[PDB]
Amino acid sequence: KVLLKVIILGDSGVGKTSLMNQYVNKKFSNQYKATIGADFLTKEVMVDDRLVTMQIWDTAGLERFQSLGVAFYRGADCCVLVFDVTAPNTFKTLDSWRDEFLIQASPRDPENFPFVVLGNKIDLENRQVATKRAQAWCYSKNNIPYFETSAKEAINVEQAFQTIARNALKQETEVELYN
């Protein structure tokens, strides 16, 4: 019935595509990253006694062109911010990814717009971004829920999208888009 649009954002190489395929296809593969990346990908899931169809948009196309981001982000219901726990430069950029999304997606209520932050690739060594640091940042931004994840080993992927959908569904129940 109800349709949720989900944007996935983050510097390339943080594991956006890999997180998509893990959530949707239960698989660790980033293949065909120029046909499904910069493209939808879909999963019918159940969300609190509501049958949802979730469109998950990968930003891997990631053209500097702001003109793309406007209609691409248009009507997003949730935005998933992803960084590499082992790459500190990808955590510093979360500020501008969130801001760029908000001014281009232009939702009516930005301060309550549902974001989720994924600290991906936690199955590595030399994790250079500290958990407490990322939760500090997330709460700083109006208590964004934060998960550490592994697309490779399938850790907290399903959990995070359960939250994503739930929070997105409390924001899409304000607009209503069934099918």
Binding site: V70, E100, I103, R108, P110
Partner: protein, 152 residues
Amino acid sequence: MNTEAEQQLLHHARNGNAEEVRQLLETMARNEVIADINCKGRSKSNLGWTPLHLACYFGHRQVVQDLLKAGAEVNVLNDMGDTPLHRAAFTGRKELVMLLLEYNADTTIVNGSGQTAKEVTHAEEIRSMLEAVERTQQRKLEELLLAAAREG
């Protein structure tokens, strides 16, 4: 490019850091820093937005009020064509609209989509406010045109 000062102004206005905004404006007022108050964002996080657009959209009333008190242009346009009034009205921020209307914002301005601020809002009280002012501005404009055309 943007100067460090006007990058600070865009950042603090977007984030509602009212005291830092006001201190910057006092420095800019005293000509101790180079910074256009109507600067357009030049980064990914703010491209084409003024500090006033940012503070209206994100609902930072003290920032808006200091920018207006400091002389910021109420009718700046972003890349979408929006005025600050479009952003405040779109987000249903009634008091911000009041403030912009109080500093003589033009309500007749059409954005890139063809929409005036009246018609991007979903708050009925804002819509009524903007309809009253828009009709008033429209009548005043039509009489000035009609007069100026009947008489060179």
